[PDB]
Amino acid sequence: GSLLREGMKVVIAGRPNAGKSSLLNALAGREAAIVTDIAGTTRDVLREHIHIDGMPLHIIDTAGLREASDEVERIGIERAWQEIEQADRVLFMVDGTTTDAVDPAEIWPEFIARLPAKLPITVVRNKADITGETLGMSEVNGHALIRLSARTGEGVDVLRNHLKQSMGIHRD
């Protein structure tokens, strides 16, 4: 390019099996939608591919932990030095108006951070019920609430446009 790059560390969560992978897929411009089994959460905790619209030849690694960052600076062929930022856009994924016990056991250890969350929105049947659990949304002041779905790309681009804007600074 012309001395003009950018990027950041993005994490994808929202309970195990609740439109996580299916989402990422739609994320990666790639078509061939491939999905595997956790087969054990990678140390680099980077199982959400490396989204990079800029250049093709670009390896990224999103840790978000001590041992993670350490493992990051090794898997991607790199000396065990220091050089890695923290998450920025921690978007959550919920399934309709479903409230599980694992729902909180994952979103709790997040509110207490220095970054936006951005919770999704539900649009399931029954009108007089959605709105109810649309504002409160458990708790916390979600950066922005945008509805979307897995199959149909209801609000994927909207979530994407709110990703490229986030990531900034950092030249490879």
Side-chain angles (χ1 to χ4, degrees), residues 93-107:
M93 267 289 119
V94 310
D95 205 326
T97 179
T98 297
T99 287
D100 280 309
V102 193
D103 244 289
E106 247 274 342
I107 196 282

Side-chain angles (χ1 to χ4, degrees), residues 5-12 20-31 45-62 89 91 156-170:
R5 265 158 280 169
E6 46 173 23
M8 258 208 199
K9 308 297 116 105
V10 285
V11 68
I12 283 177
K20 247 145 79 247
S21 304
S22 232
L23 178 122
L24 119 63
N25 167 220
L27 215 81
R30 295 222 267 284
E31 259 71 30
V45 57
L46 169 94
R47 57 135 108 85
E48 55 138 278
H49 262 190
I50 56 133
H51 185 128
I52 176 82
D53 264 317
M55 258 246 182
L57 234 137
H58 199 315
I59 73 96
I60 302 137
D61 11 41
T62 290
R89 275 288 186 289
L91 101 303
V156 167
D157 302 82
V158 170
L159 167 117
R160 185 223 220 73
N161 197 1
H162 267 186
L163 222 182
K164 226 204 212 163
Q165 225 257 58
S166 305
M167 73 189 229
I169 311 277
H170 219 268

Side-chain angles (χ1 to χ4, degrees), residues 73-136:
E73 295 262 274
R74 180 217 97 194
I75 213 314
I77 299 128
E78 235 138 50
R79 298 175 279 291
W81 234 325
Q82 185 236 92
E83 246 310 281
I84 183 103
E85 253 218 65
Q86 207 157 271
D88 191 77
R89 275 288 186 289
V90 69
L91 101 303
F92 286 91
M93 267 289 119
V94 310
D95 205 326
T97 179
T98 297
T99 287
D100 280 309
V102 193
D103 244 289
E106 247 274 342
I107 196 282
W108 249 28
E110 300 295 321
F111 157 40
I112 200 307
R114 210 206 269 173
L115 58 131
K118 214 165 126 279
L119 267 155
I121 282 193
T122 158
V123 68
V124 74
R125 59 172 75 173
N126 247 101
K127 226 212 146 146
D129 212 282
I130 288 304
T131 56
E133 259 179 323
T134 283
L135 275 104

